[PDB]
């Protein structure tokens, strides 16, 4: 899937939650907000094809 | 400095330990066990002390400061 | 690249230098990318993101 | 070898590289007609031995 600016902002603002804040305090947080794009083989070629 | 305001922050492990100290502080009376800092809990990230003109006049900070100035003067006197 | 990486690290370092307190960390929301060079001609964008 | 995501150890490529190393160890390695540009090859460095 592909996000809107509002959706991405909601995701990051949730990443600014108190729970993720303390999580970052105790341990660096890697938040994959990619909408499943990592599972596409040859993303550049597929994008150019589309 | 005698700051008018002073915010203690509870971020990181040291912050959690300090918050635990503040939470464990209890005002036992006759047996009731009301907490000194009722507004501090596990979900609080900070606590602010409030004074009208300066925190050095506050009882919690005045007493340690005065006890300590007297102790330090007496210990320098002892060293002499 | 300077904007995206070097001055970013300098901003974080300046905040750290300004903080003598150790109990109020600043949460740095790094805009990481899932695509480090897989897409086409982007200059040093992928370099900075990785 | 790069999988459909990241880089993981590969048996075939590793065996090829180690076989090349074995060949270089026994018979030596010719670099004739190889035009190289090496930097950071001062005395007491890996580049100097290269």
From Swiss-Prot, chain B:
Highest taxon, organism lineage: Eukaryota
Transmembrane segments: none
Functional summary from the UniProt entry: Fatty acid synthetase catalyzes the formation of long-chain fatty acids from acetyl-CoA, malonyl-CoA and NADPH. The beta subunit contains domains for: [acyl-carrier-protein] acetyltransferase and malonyltransferase, S-acyl fatty acid synthase thioesterase, enoyl-[acyl-carrier-protein] reductase, and 3-hydroxypalmitoyl-[acyl-carrier-protein] dehydratase.
Subunit structure and binding partners: [Alpha(6)beta(6)] hexamers of two multifunctional subunits (alpha and beta).
Family to which the UniProt record says this protein belongs: Belongs to the fungal fatty acid synthetase subunit beta family.
Protein name: Fatty acid synthase subunit beta
Residues shown, of full length: 1699 to 1783 of 2037
UniProtKB/Swiss-Prot annotation, chain C:
Leader sequence residues: none
Domain of life: Eukaryota
Self-association state and partner proteins as the record states: [Alpha(6)beta(6)] hexamers of two multifunctional subunits (alpha and beta).
Function field: Fatty acid synthetase catalyzes the formation of long-chain fatty acids from acetyl-CoA, malonyl-CoA and NADPH. The alpha subunit contains domains for: acyl carrier protein, 3-oxoacyl-[acyl-carrier-protein] reductase, and 3-oxoacyl-[acyl-carrier-protein] synthase.
Family note: Belongs to the thiolase-like superfamily. Fungal fatty acid synthetase subunit alpha family.
Protein name: Fatty acid synthase subunit alpha
Origin organism lineage: Eukaryota, Fungi, Dikarya, Ascomycota, Saccharomycotina
Gene name per UniProt: FAS2
Part of the full-length chain shown: 795 to 844 of 1885
